[PDB]
N, CA, C and O atoms as a GROMACS GRO file, in nm:
protein
  516
    1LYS      N    1  -8.287  -2.720   3.594
    1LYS     CA    2  -8.329  -2.690   3.735
    1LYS      C    3  -8.267  -2.558   3.780
    1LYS      O    4  -8.147  -2.536   3.760
    2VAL      N    5  -8.347  -2.472   3.841
    2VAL     CA    6  -8.295  -2.354   3.906
    2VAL      C    7  -8.285  -2.389   4.056
    2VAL      O    8  -8.385  -2.408   4.126
    3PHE      N    9  -8.159  -2.396   4.101
    3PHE     CA   10  -8.131  -2.421   4.241
    3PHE      C   11  -8.157  -2.298   4.325
    3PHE      O   12  -8.138  -2.184   4.280
    4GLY      N   13  -8.202  -2.322   4.448
    4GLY     CA   14  -8.185  -2.219   4.552
    4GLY      C   15  -8.039  -2.211   4.595
    4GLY      O   16  -7.963  -2.306   4.578
    5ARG      N   17  -8.001  -2.097   4.652
    5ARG     CA   18  -7.863  -2.075   4.694
    5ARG      C   19  -7.812  -2.180   4.795
    5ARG      O   20  -7.708  -2.243   4.772
    6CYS      N   21  -7.886  -2.198   4.905
    6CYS     CA   22  -7.847  -2.298   5.002
    6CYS      C   23  -7.860  -2.439   4.951
    6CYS      O   24  -7.781  -2.526   4.987
    7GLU      N   25  -7.961  -2.464   4.867
    7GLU     CA   26  -7.975  -2.592   4.802
    7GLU      C   27  -7.849  -2.628   4.720
    7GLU      O   28  -7.798  -2.739   4.728
    8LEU      N   29  -7.801  -2.531   4.642
    8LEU     CA   30  -7.683  -2.556   4.565
    8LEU      C   31  -7.559  -2.571   4.652
    8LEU      O   32  -7.475  -2.658   4.628
    9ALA      N   33  -7.548  -2.487   4.752
    9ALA     CA   34  -7.437  -2.499   4.847
    9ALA      C   35  -7.427  -2.643   4.904
    9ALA      O   36  -7.319  -2.702   4.909
   10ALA      N   37  -7.542  -2.697   4.945
   10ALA     CA   38  -7.543  -2.834   5.003
   10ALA      C   39  -7.508  -2.939   4.902
   10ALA      O   40  -7.439  -3.036   4.934
   11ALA      N   41  -7.553  -2.922   4.777
   11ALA     CA   42  -7.517  -3.019   4.673
   11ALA      C   43  -7.368  -3.016   4.637
   11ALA      O   44  -7.303  -3.120   4.622
   12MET      N   45  -7.314  -2.894   4.624
   12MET     CA   46  -7.173  -2.877   4.596
   12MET      C   47  -7.090  -2.934   4.708
   12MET      O   48  -6.987  -2.998   4.684
   13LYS      N   49  -7.135  -2.913   4.833
   13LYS     CA   50  -7.063  -2.965   4.948
   13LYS      C   51  -7.064  -3.118   4.947
   13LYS      O   52  -6.961  -3.182   4.967
   14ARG      N   53  -7.182  -3.176   4.922
   14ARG     CA   54  -7.198  -3.319   4.920
   14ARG      C   55  -7.104  -3.383   4.821
   14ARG      O   56  -7.047  -3.489   4.847
   15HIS      N   57  -7.086  -3.318   4.707
   15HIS     CA   58  -6.998  -3.365   4.598
   15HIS      C   59  -6.851  -3.330   4.615
   15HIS      O   60  -6.770  -3.358   4.526
   16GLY      N   61  -6.816  -3.269   4.727
   16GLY     CA   62  -6.674  -3.245   4.759
   16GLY      C   63  -6.608  -3.121   4.703
   16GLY      O   64  -6.485  -3.116   4.693
   17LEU      N   65  -6.686  -3.020   4.667
   17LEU     CA   66  -6.625  -2.893   4.624
   17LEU      C   67  -6.582  -2.800   4.735
   17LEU      O   68  -6.500  -2.712   4.709
   18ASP      N   69  -6.631  -2.813   4.858
   18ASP     CA   70  -6.591  -2.721   4.966
   18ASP      C   71  -6.444  -2.748   4.992
   18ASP      O   72  -6.403  -2.857   5.032
   19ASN      N   73  -6.365  -2.644   4.968
   19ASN     CA   74  -6.220  -2.646   4.985
   19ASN      C   75  -6.143  -2.724   4.878
   19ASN      O   76  -6.023  -2.748   4.895
   20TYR      N   77  -6.208  -2.764   4.769
   20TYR     CA   78  -6.142  -2.832   4.662
   20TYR      C   79  -6.037  -2.743   4.596
   20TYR      O   80  -6.069  -2.632   4.552
   21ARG      N   81  -5.914  -2.790   4.591
   21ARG     CA   82  -5.803  -2.707   4.543
   21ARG      C   83  -5.789  -2.576   4.621
   21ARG      O   84  -5.739  -2.477   4.568
   22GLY      N   85  -5.833  -2.578   4.747
   22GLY     CA   86  -5.826  -2.463   4.831
   22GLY      C   87  -5.928  -2.355   4.810
   22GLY      O   88  -5.909  -2.244   4.858
   23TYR      N   89  -6.036  -2.384   4.739
   23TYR     CA   90  -6.146  -2.286   4.721
   23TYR      C   91  -6.264  -2.324   4.804
   23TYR      O   92  -6.328  -2.426   4.781
   24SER      N   93  -6.292  -2.239   4.903
   24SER     CA   94  -6.404  -2.263   4.993
   24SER      C   95  -6.539  -2.260   4.916
   24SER      O   96  -6.551  -2.202   4.808
   25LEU      N   97  -6.637  -2.322   4.976
   25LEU     CA   98  -6.769  -2.340   4.917
   25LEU      C   99  -6.830  -2.209   4.869
   25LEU      O  100  -6.897  -2.209   4.766
   26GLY      N  101  -6.810  -2.098   4.939
   26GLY     CA  102  -6.869  -1.971   4.890
   26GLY      C  103  -6.815  -1.926   4.756
   26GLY      O  104  -6.887  -1.862   4.679
   27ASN      N  105  -6.690  -1.957   4.726
   27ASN     CA  106  -6.636  -1.927   4.593
   27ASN      C  107  -6.713  -1.997   4.484
   27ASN      O  108  -6.741  -1.938   4.379
   28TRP      N  109  -6.747  -2.124   4.506
   28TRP     CA  110  -6.817  -2.204   4.403
   28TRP      C  111  -6.961  -2.159   4.389
   28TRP      O  112  -7.016  -2.157   4.278
   29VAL      N  113  -7.024  -2.122   4.501
   29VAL     CA  114  -7.161  -2.070   4.495
   29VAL      C  115  -7.165  -1.934   4.425
   29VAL      O  116  -7.252  -1.909   4.341
   30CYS      N  117  -7.073  -1.847   4.459
   30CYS     CA  118  -7.063  -1.719   4.394
   30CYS      C  119  -7.036  -1.735   4.244
   30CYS      O  120  -7.095  -1.664   4.162
   31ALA      N  121  -6.948  -1.827   4.208
   31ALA     CA  122  -6.919  -1.849   4.066
   31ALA      C  123  -7.047  -1.893   3.994
   31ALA      O  124  -7.081  -1.840   3.888
   32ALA      N  125  -7.117  -1.990   4.051
   32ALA     CA  126  -7.246  -2.035   3.991
   32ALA      C  127  -7.349  -1.924   3.979
   32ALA      O  128  -7.421  -1.915   3.880
   33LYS      N  129  -7.355  -1.838   4.080
   33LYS     CA  130  -7.451  -1.728   4.075
   33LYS      C  131  -7.427  -1.642   3.953
   33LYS      O  132  -7.520  -1.609   3.879
   34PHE      N  133  -7.299  -1.605   3.933
   34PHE     CA  134  -7.270  -1.510   3.825
   34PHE      C  135  -7.251  -1.574   3.691
   34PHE      O  136  -7.267  -1.507   3.589
   35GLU      N  137  -7.218  -1.703   3.687
   35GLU     CA  138  -7.214  -1.772   3.557
   35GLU      C  139  -7.354  -1.804   3.504
   35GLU      O  140  -7.382  -1.781   3.386
   36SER      N  141  -7.440  -1.858   3.588
   36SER     CA  142  -7.570  -1.918   3.542
   36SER      C  143  -7.692  -1.874   3.618
   36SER      O  144  -7.803  -1.915   3.584
   37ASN      N  145  -7.678  -1.791   3.723
   37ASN     CA  146  -7.787  -1.759   3.813
   37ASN      C  147  -7.849  -1.887   3.873
   37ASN      O  148  -7.969  -1.894   3.898
   38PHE      N  149  -7.763  -1.987   3.897
   38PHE     CA  150  -7.799  -2.116   3.960
   38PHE      C  151  -7.889  -2.202   3.871
   38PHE      O  152  -7.959  -2.290   3.921
   39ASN      N  153  -7.886  -2.179   3.740
   39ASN     CA  154  -7.974  -2.251   3.647
   39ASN      C  155  -7.891  -2.354   3.571
   39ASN      O  156  -7.803  -2.318   3.492
   40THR      N  157  -7.920  -2.482   3.594
   40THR     CA  158  -7.847  -2.586   3.524
   40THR      C  159  -7.863  -2.582   3.373
   40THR      O  160  -7.775  -2.628   3.301
   41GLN      N  161  -7.976  -2.527   3.324
   41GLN     CA  162  -8.002  -2.527   3.181
   41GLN      C  163  -7.939  -2.413   3.104
   41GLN      O  164  -7.959  -2.405   2.983
   42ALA      N  165  -7.864  -2.324   3.170
   42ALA     CA  166  -7.808  -2.209   3.103
   42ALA      C  167  -7.707  -2.252   2.994
   42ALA      O  168  -7.624  -2.340   3.014
   43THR      N  169  -7.718  -2.186   2.878
   43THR     CA  170  -7.624  -2.199   2.766
   43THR      C  171  -7.592  -2.063   2.710
   43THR      O  172  -7.678  -1.974   2.708
   44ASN      N  173  -7.469  -2.045   2.663
   44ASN     CA  174  -7.429  -1.919   2.603
   44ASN      C  175  -7.324  -1.942   2.498
   44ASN      O  176  -7.219  -1.999   2.525
   45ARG      N  177  -7.351  -1.897   2.376
   45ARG     CA  178  -7.252  -1.910   2.266
   45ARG      C  179  -7.141  -1.809   2.286
   45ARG      O  180  -7.164  -1.697   2.332
   46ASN      N  181  -7.020  -1.851   2.251
   46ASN     CA  182  -6.901  -1.766   2.252
   46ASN      C  183  -6.858  -1.725   2.110
   46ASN      O  184  -6.898  -1.789   2.013
   47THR      N  185  -6.779  -1.620   2.100
   47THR     CA  186  -6.736  -1.574   1.965
   47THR      C  187  -6.659  -1.678   1.887
   47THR      O  188  -6.668  -1.681   1.764
   48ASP      N  189  -6.583  -1.764   1.956
   48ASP     CA  190  -6.504  -1.863   1.878
   48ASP      C  191  -6.583  -1.982   1.827
   48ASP      O  192  -6.525  -2.074   1.769
   49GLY      N  193  -6.714  -1.980   1.847
   49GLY     CA  194  -6.802  -2.087   1.803
   49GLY      C  195  -6.831  -2.194   1.906
   49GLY      O  196  -6.917  -2.279   1.884
   50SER      N  197  -6.760  -2.190   2.018
   50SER     CA  198  -6.788  -2.276   2.130
   50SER      C  199  -6.911  -2.224   2.205
   50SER      O  200  -6.960  -2.114   2.179
   51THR      N  201  -6.958  -2.305   2.298
   51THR     CA  202  -7.071  -2.272   2.382
   51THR      C  203  -7.035  -2.311   2.526
   51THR      O  204  -6.959  -2.405   2.550
   52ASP      N  205  -7.091  -2.235   2.620
   52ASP     CA  206  -7.076  -2.262   2.765
   52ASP      C  207  -7.206  -2.323   2.815
   52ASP      O  208  -7.315  -2.280   2.777
   53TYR      N  209  -7.193  -2.425   2.902
   53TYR     CA  210  -7.305  -2.505   2.947
   53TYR      C  211  -7.311  -2.523   3.098
   53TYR      O  212  -7.211  -2.550   3.164
   54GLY      N  213  -7.432  -2.506   3.150
   54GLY     CA  214  -7.464  -2.548   3.284
   54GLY      C  215  -7.438  -2.444   3.392
   54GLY      O  216  -7.412  -2.327   3.364
   55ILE      N  217  -7.447  -2.490   3.518
   55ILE     CA  218  -7.437  -2.402   3.634
   55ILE      C  219  -7.305  -2.328   3.643
   55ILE      O  220  -7.298  -2.218   3.698
   56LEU      N  221  -7.199  -2.390   3.589
   56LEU     CA  222  -7.067  -2.331   3.589
   56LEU      C  223  -7.015  -2.295   3.450
   56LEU      O  224  -6.897  -2.266   3.431
   57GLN      N  225  -7.106  -2.297   3.353
   57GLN     CA  226  -7.081  -2.244   3.219
   57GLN      C  227  -6.949  -2.299   3.162
   57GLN      O  228  -6.858  -2.224   3.126
   58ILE      N  229  -6.941  -2.432   3.154
   58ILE     CA  230  -6.824  -2.503   3.107
   58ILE      C  231  -6.822  -2.509   2.952
   58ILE      O  232  -6.926  -2.534   2.890
   59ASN      N  233  -6.706  -2.487   2.893
   59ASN     CA  234  -6.693  -2.460   2.752
   59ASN      C  235  -6.668  -2.581   2.665
   59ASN      O  236  -6.593  -2.671   2.703
   60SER      N  237  -6.731  -2.582   2.547
   60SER     CA  238  -6.723  -2.694   2.455
   60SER      C  239  -6.596  -2.701   2.370
   60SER      O  240  -6.579  -2.798   2.296
   61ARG      N  241  -6.506  -2.601   2.377
   61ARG     CA  242  -6.380  -2.614   2.302
   61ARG      C  243  -6.284  -2.712   2.369
   61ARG      O  244  -6.220  -2.793   2.302
   62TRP      N  245  -6.274  -2.703   2.500
   62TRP     CA  246  -6.183  -2.788   2.577
   62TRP      C  247  -6.247  -2.905   2.649
   62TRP      O  248  -6.187  -3.012   2.657
   63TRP      N  249  -6.367  -2.887   2.703
   63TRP     CA  250  -6.410  -2.970   2.817
   63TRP      C  251  -6.515  -3.075   2.782
   63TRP      O  252  -6.510  -3.186   2.834
   64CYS      N  253  -6.610  -3.041   2.695
   64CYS     CA  254  -6.723  -3.131   2.665
   64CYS      C  255  -6.751  -3.124   2.517
   64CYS      O  256  -6.716  -3.028   2.449
   65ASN      N  257  -6.816  -3.230   2.467
   65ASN     CA  258  -6.850  -3.236   2.325
   65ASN      C  259  -6.994  -3.194   2.296
   65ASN      O  260  -7.088  -3.252   2.351
   66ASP      N  261  -7.010  -3.094   2.210
   66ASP     CA  262  -7.145  -3.052   2.167
   66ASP      C  263  -7.175  -3.077   2.020
   66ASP      O  264  -7.281  -3.040   1.971
   67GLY      N  265  -7.080  -3.141   1.951
   67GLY     CA  266  -7.094  -3.176   1.813
   67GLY      C  267  -7.080  -3.063   1.713
   67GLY      O  268  -7.093  -3.086   1.593
   68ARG      N  269  -7.054  -2.941   1.759
   68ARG     CA  270  -7.046  -2.827   1.667
   68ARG      C  271  -6.930  -2.732   1.691
   68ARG      O  272  -6.929  -2.620   1.639
   69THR      N  273  -6.831  -2.775   1.771
   69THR     CA  274  -6.718  -2.690   1.807
   69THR      C  275  -6.586  -2.749   1.746
   69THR      O  276  -6.521  -2.831   1.811
   70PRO      N  277  -6.546  -2.710   1.623
   70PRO     CA  278  -6.431  -2.786   1.570
   70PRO      C  279  -6.301  -2.771   1.655
   70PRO      O  280  -6.275  -2.666   1.712
   71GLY      N  281  -6.222  -2.878   1.661
   71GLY     CA  282  -6.101  -2.877   1.746
   71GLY      C  283  -6.139  -2.879   1.892
   71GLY      O  284  -6.070  -2.825   1.978
   72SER      N  285  -6.251  -2.943   1.917
   72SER     CA  286  -6.296  -2.972   2.050
   72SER      C  287  -6.206  -3.086   2.102
   72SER      O  288  -6.175  -3.181   2.029
   73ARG      N  289  -6.166  -3.075   2.227
   73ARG     CA  290  -6.083  -3.171   2.296
   73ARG      C  291  -6.158  -3.263   2.392
   73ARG      O  292  -6.108  -3.369   2.427
   74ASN      N  293  -6.277  -3.224   2.436
   74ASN     CA  294  -6.356  -3.311   2.526
   74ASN      C  295  -6.275  -3.372   2.640
   74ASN      O  296  -6.274  -3.494   2.658
   75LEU      N  297  -6.208  -3.286   2.717
   75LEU     CA  298  -6.124  -3.335   2.824
   75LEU      C  299  -6.199  -3.398   2.940
   75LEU      O  300  -6.142  -3.480   3.012
   76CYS      N  301  -6.327  -3.360   2.960
   76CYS     CA  302  -6.408  -3.421   3.062
   76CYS      C  303  -6.477  -3.546   3.013
   76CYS      O  304  -6.542  -3.616   3.091
   77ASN      N  305  -6.463  -3.577   2.882
   77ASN     CA  306  -6.521  -3.701   2.826
   77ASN      C  307  -6.674  -3.715   2.851
   77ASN      O  308  -6.722  -3.817   2.900
   78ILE      N  309  -6.744  -3.611   2.814
   78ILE     CA  310  -6.889  -3.600   2.834
   78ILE      C  311  -6.953  -3.522   2.718
   78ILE      O  312  -6.891  -3.433   2.660
   79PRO      N  313  -7.077  -3.557   2.686
   79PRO     CA  314  -7.155  -3.463   2.605
   79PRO      C  315  -7.187  -3.338   2.685
   79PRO      O  316  -7.212  -3.345   2.806
   80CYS      N  317  -7.186  -3.223   2.617
   80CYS     CA  318  -7.220  -3.098   2.688
   80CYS      C  319  -7.359  -3.101   2.755
   80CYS      O  320  -7.378  -3.039   2.860
   81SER      N  321  -7.452  -3.172   2.695
   81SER     CA  322  -7.584  -3.187   2.752
   81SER      C  323  -7.583  -3.246   2.891
   81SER      O  324  -7.674  -3.218   2.968
   82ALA      N  325  -7.482  -3.327   2.925
   82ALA     CA  326  -7.475  -3.381   3.062
   82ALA      C  327  -7.459  -3.269   3.164
   82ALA      O  328  -7.496  -3.285   3.280
   83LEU      N  329  -7.403  -3.155   3.120
   83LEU     CA  330  -7.382  -3.040   3.209
   83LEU      C  331  -7.512  -2.960   3.231
   83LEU      O  332  -7.511  -2.863   3.307
   84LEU      N  333  -7.622  -2.996   3.166
   84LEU     CA  334  -7.750  -2.926   3.181
   84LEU      C  335  -7.850  -2.996   3.275
   84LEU      O  336  -7.956  -2.943   3.306
   85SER      N  337  -7.813  -3.117   3.320
   85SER     CA  338  -7.899  -3.198   3.403
   85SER      C  339  -7.935  -3.130   3.534
   85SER      O  340  -7.862  -3.043   3.582
   86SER      N  341  -8.047  -3.170   3.592
   86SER     CA  342  -8.074  -3.136   3.730
   86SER      C  343  -7.976  -3.197   3.829
   86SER      O  344  -7.958  -3.144   3.939
   87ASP      N  345  -7.911  -3.306   3.792
   87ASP     CA  346  -7.806  -3.372   3.868
   87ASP      C  347  -7.676  -3.305   3.834
   87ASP      O  348  -7.629  -3.317   3.722
   88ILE      N  349  -7.617  -3.235   3.930
   88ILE     CA  350  -7.492  -3.157   3.905
   88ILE      C  351  -7.364  -3.241   3.903
   88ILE      O  352  -7.255  -3.187   3.887
   89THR      N  353  -7.376  -3.373   3.919
   89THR     CA  354  -7.257  -3.456   3.928
   89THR      C  355  -7.156  -3.430   3.813
   89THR      O  356  -7.037  -3.412   3.838
   90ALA      N  357  -7.204  -3.428   3.688
   90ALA     CA  358  -7.112  -3.411   3.575
   90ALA      C  359  -7.045  -3.273   3.578
   90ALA      O  360  -6.925  -3.262   3.554
   91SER      N  361  -7.123  -3.167   3.606
   91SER     CA  362  -7.066  -3.034   3.618
   91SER      C  363  -6.958  -3.032   3.728
   91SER      O  364  -6.850  -2.976   3.708
   92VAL      N  365  -6.988  -3.092   3.844
   92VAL     CA  366  -6.888  -3.088   3.952
   92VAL      C  367  -6.760  -3.162   3.908
   92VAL      O  368  -6.650  -3.111   3.926
   93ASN      N  369  -6.775  -3.283   3.852
   93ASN     CA  370  -6.656  -3.359   3.813
   93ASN      C  371  -6.569  -3.281   3.712
   93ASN      O  372  -6.446  -3.282   3.720
   94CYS      N  373  -6.636  -3.216   3.618
   94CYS     CA  374  -6.564  -3.142   3.518
   94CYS      C  375  -6.505  -3.017   3.579
   94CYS      O  376  -6.392  -2.981   3.545
   95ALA      N  377  -6.577  -2.948   3.669
   95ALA     CA  378  -6.520  -2.832   3.740
   95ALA      C  379  -6.394  -2.866   3.818
   95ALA      O  380  -6.301  -2.785   3.826
   96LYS      N  381  -6.391  -2.984   3.877
   96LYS     CA  382  -6.272  -3.030   3.949
   96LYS      C  383  -6.153  -3.041   3.857
   96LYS      O  384  -6.042  -3.004   3.896
   97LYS      N  385  -6.173  -3.092   3.735
   97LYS     CA  386  -6.062  -3.099   3.639
   97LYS      C  387  -6.016  -2.956   3.598
   97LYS      O  388  -5.897  -2.927   3.592
   98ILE      N  389  -6.113  -2.870   3.572
   98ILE     CA  390  -6.085  -2.734   3.523
   98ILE      C  391  -6.001  -2.657   3.629
   98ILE      O  392  -5.902  -2.592   3.596
   99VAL      N  393  -6.043  -2.664   3.755
   99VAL     CA  394  -5.976  -2.588   3.862
   99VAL      C  395  -5.841  -2.642   3.898
   99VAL      O  396  -5.760  -2.574   3.961
  100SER      N  397  -5.814  -2.767   3.856
  100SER     CA  398  -5.686  -2.828   3.869
  100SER      C  399  -5.588  -2.796   3.756
  100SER      O  400  -5.474  -2.841   3.761
  101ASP      N  401  -5.630  -2.719   3.654
  101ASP     CA  402  -5.558  -2.707   3.526
  101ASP      C  403  -5.441  -2.614   3.532
  101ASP      O  404  -5.359  -2.613   3.440
  102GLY      N  405  -5.428  -2.533   3.639
  102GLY     CA  406  -5.310  -2.445   3.659
  102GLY      C  407  -5.344  -2.304   3.709
  102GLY      O  408  -5.272  -2.249   3.792
  103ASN      N  409  -5.453  -2.247   3.658
  103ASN     CA  410  -5.494  -2.111   3.699
  103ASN      C  411  -5.608  -2.107   3.801
  103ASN      O  412  -5.668  -2.002   3.822
  104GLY      N  413  -5.639  -2.221   3.865
  104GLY     CA  414  -5.735  -2.223   3.968
  104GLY      C  415  -5.868  -2.170   3.916
  104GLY      O  416  -5.905  -2.194   3.801
  105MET      N  417  -5.939  -2.098   4.002
  105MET     CA  418  -6.069  -2.046   3.961
  105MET      C  419  -6.066  -1.928   3.864
  105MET      O  420  -6.170  -1.884   3.816
  106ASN      N  421  -5.945  -1.876   3.835
  106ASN     CA  422  -5.934  -1.773   3.732
  106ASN      C  423  -5.983  -1.826   3.597
  106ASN      O  424  -6.011  -1.747   3.506
  107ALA      N  425  -5.995  -1.960   3.581
  107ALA     CA  426  -6.054  -2.015   3.461
  107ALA      C  427  -6.195  -1.967   3.438
  107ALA      O  428  -6.240  -1.963   3.323
  108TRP      N  429  -6.266  -1.929   3.543
  108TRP     CA  430  -6.400  -1.872   3.533
  108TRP      C  431  -6.390  -1.718   3.538
  108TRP      O  432  -6.376  -1.658   3.645
  109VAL      N  433  -6.397  -1.657   3.422
  109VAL     CA  434  -6.383  -1.512   3.415
  109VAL      C  435  -6.491  -1.444   3.504
  109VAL      O  436  -6.464  -1.338   3.560
  110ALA      N  437  -6.609  -1.501   3.517
  110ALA     CA  438  -6.716  -1.440   3.606
  110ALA      C  439  -6.672  -1.446   3.753
  110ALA      O  440  -6.705  -1.357   3.832
  111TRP      N  441  -6.597  -1.552   3.790
  111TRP     CA  442  -6.545  -1.559   3.926
  111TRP      C  443  -6.441  -1.448   3.942
  111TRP      O  444  -6.445  -1.372   4.039
  112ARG      N  445  -6.348  -1.438   3.846
  112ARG     CA  446  -6.244  -1.334   3.855
  112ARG      C  447  -6.310  -1.196   3.869
  112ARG      O  448  -6.266  -1.115   3.951
  113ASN      N  449  -6.414  -1.169   3.790
  113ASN     CA  450  -6.470  -1.036   3.784
  113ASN      C  451  -6.570  -0.996   3.891
  113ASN      O  452  -6.588  -0.877   3.917
  114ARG      N  453  -6.635  -1.094   3.954
  114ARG     CA  454  -6.738  -1.066   4.052
  114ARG      C  455  -6.729  -1.136   4.186
  114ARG      O  456  -6.807  -1.109   4.277
  115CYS      N  457  -6.632  -1.229   4.199
  115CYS     CA  458  -6.615  -1.306   4.321
  115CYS      C  459  -6.477  -1.288   4.383
  115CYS      O  460  -6.466  -1.267   4.504
  116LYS      N  461  -6.373  -1.295   4.302
  116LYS     CA  462  -6.234  -1.288   4.355
  116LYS      C  463  -6.215  -1.158   4.431
  116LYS      O  464  -6.250  -1.050   4.382
  117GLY      N  465  -6.161  -1.170   4.550
  117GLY     CA  466  -6.140  -1.052   4.634
  117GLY      C  467  -6.254  -0.998   4.715
  117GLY      O  468  -6.240  -0.899   4.786
  118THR      N  469  -6.369  -1.064   4.704
  118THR     CA  470  -6.489  -1.026   4.775
  118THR      C  471  -6.511  -1.122   4.892
  118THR      O  472  -6.440  -1.221   4.907
  119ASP      N  473  -6.612  -1.091   4.976
  119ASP     CA  474  -6.644  -1.172   5.090
  119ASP      C  475  -6.728  -1.289   5.039
  119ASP      O  476  -6.850  -1.288   5.050
  120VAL      N  477  -6.660  -1.391   4.984
  120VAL     CA  478  -6.734  -1.504   4.924
  120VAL      C  479  -6.812  -1.588   5.024
  120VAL      O  480  -6.907  -1.656   4.986
  121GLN      N  481  -6.772  -1.586   5.152
  121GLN     CA  482  -6.843  -1.658   5.256
  121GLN      C  483  -6.987  -1.611   5.270
  121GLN      O  484  -7.073  -1.685   5.319
  122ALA      N  485  -7.014  -1.487   5.228
  122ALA     CA  486  -7.150  -1.437   5.232
  122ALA      C  487  -7.246  -1.527   5.157
  122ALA      O  488  -7.362  -1.541   5.195
  123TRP      N  489  -7.196  -1.588   5.052
  123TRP     CA  490  -7.278  -1.677   4.969
  123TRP      C  491  -7.326  -1.803   5.035
  123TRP      O  492  -7.416  -1.869   4.982
  124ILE      N  493  -7.270  -1.840   5.150
  124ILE     CA  494  -7.321  -1.953   5.227
  124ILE      C  495  -7.384  -1.912   5.362
  124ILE      O  496  -7.420  -1.998   5.443
  125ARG      N  497  -7.397  -1.783   5.384
  125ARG     CA  498  -7.463  -1.736   5.506
  125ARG      C  499  -7.608  -1.779   5.517
  125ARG      O  500  -7.684  -1.775   5.420
  126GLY      N  501  -7.646  -1.819   5.637
  126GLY     CA  502  -7.783  -1.860   5.662
  126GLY      C  503  -7.812  -2.005   5.630
  126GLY      O  504  -7.918  -2.057   5.666
  127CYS      N  505  -7.720  -2.071   5.562
  127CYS     CA  506  -7.744  -2.207   5.516
  127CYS      C  507  -7.708  -2.306   5.627
  127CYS      O  508  -7.618  -2.280   5.707
  128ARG      N  509  -7.779  -2.419   5.632
  128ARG     CA  510  -7.748  -2.529   5.728
  128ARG      C  511  -7.665  -2.637   5.660
  128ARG      O  512  -7.719  -2.724   5.592
  129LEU      N  513  -7.535  -2.630   5.681
  129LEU     CA  514  -7.439  -2.708   5.603
  129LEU      C  515  -7.350  -2.791   5.691
  129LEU      O  516  -7.263  -2.862   5.642
   0.00000   0.00000   0.00000
């Protein structure tokens, strides 16, 4: 599913990401924009043989099992395919674990490079939330 911006904002909010670990909703929307362009089906292979999955491009070395990433830890206890659903529940639950891991949203290099330090509230402008 390709979410609209406000559509995704409302879903993320509903699932409790607004202000989760102190990151306001615009941070999560901005991260999704630059990781996946709001597309739940996005996948991208990495050089180490892992793959990133879903709206928040969560990685198969640590977080989810894709059956092809040796020394996978599956810390979210999910198949990576669950992160591709139109239902963002699995992505949100796993994102909550990731952002709790110590480096906050710096875990998402696209957030660090295109969101951190910017006016992230812009990403929820115009939305009825």
